[PDB]
């Protein structure tokens, strides 16, 4: 696979690794999303150690209002983080 | 870096690799977009060999109407292709 193709498979992989832990296997619940950020975005995002922060991140991400982050929402999250990095480091 | 972090860096890298070739160093013109898809998405998307296909792809991802693909628009493109790969495997 190319570098881009690899990167895409890696986004699918990490989503599944966290979404399948509990409840809906295809959605991130707040605790799944917290572990994903803390473990996998430890350099791009401040560690989450407060319920209020987990809450705010889900509120921000959850466009369909079911209190979970689905794959489309996770893509949007990936784009906002990646964009932030893009901008920040130039 | 985590696999997710490395993937995000990979998106910014490839984008810069192609956007930097001609004209606007920070946006993809049609020629740069065609070569990105052809070289970097050769295992996920059919090879582009017709002007009308690159025209149509650009029209599709060019949401601000400048005839180029900026990083934000490239991220929506990445999300489209990733989603398709996701579905494909399932
Ligand atoms: Ca879940
Ligand atoms: Ca949701
Ligand atoms: Ca360019
Ligand atoms: Ca545009
Ligand atoms: Zn899935
Ligand atoms: Zn840039």
């Amino acid at each position: 696979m190319s570098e881009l193709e690899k990167a895409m498979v890696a986004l699918i992989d990490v989503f599944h690794q966290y979404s399948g832990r509990e409840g809906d296997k295809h959605k991130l619940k707040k605790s799944e999303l917290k572990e994903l950020i803390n473990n996998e975005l430890s350099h791009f995002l401040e560690e989450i150690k407060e319920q209020e922060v987990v809450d705010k991140v889900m509120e921000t991400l959850d466009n369909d209002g079911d209190g979970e982050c689905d794959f489309q929402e996770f893509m949007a999250f990936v784009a906002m983080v990646t964009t932030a990095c893009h901008e920040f480091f130039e």
Side-chain angles (χ1 to χ4, degrees), chain A residues 1-24 26-28 30-45 47-55 57-90:
Chain A
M1 270 187 298
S2 76
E3 294 323 305
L4 180 57
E5 285 159 351
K6 291 191 311 203
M8 289 173 167
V9 167
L11 300 177
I12 300 170
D13 280 359
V14 70
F15 182 78
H16 278 151
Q17 287 161 6
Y18 287 88
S19 64
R21 294 176 166 199
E22 270 159 345
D24 195 319
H26 236 197
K27 293 188 194 47
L28 296 169
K30 285 186 181 182
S31 67
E32 287 168 340
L33 176 66
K34 185 187 143 189
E35 302 305 353
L36 186 152
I37 296 149
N38 284 178
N39 295 153
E40 317 301 339
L41 296 167
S42 68
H43 310 104
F44 289 159
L45 300 178
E47 194 198 346
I48 305 170
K49 302 178 256 67
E50 288 303 332
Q51 185 67 52
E52 80 153 295
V53 175
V54 186
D55 288 349
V57 173
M58 186 67 75
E59 178 175 7
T60 305
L61 285 184
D62 178 32
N63 298 307
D64 70 0
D66 67 349
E68 316 237 334
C69 182
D70 68 11
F71 189 76
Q72 176 185 5
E73 288 157 345
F74 178 64
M75 302 279 74
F77 177 56
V78 171
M80 55 179 290
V81 182
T82 299
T83 301
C85 180
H86 181 233
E87 323 284 24
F88 188 88
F89 285 116
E90 292 190 343

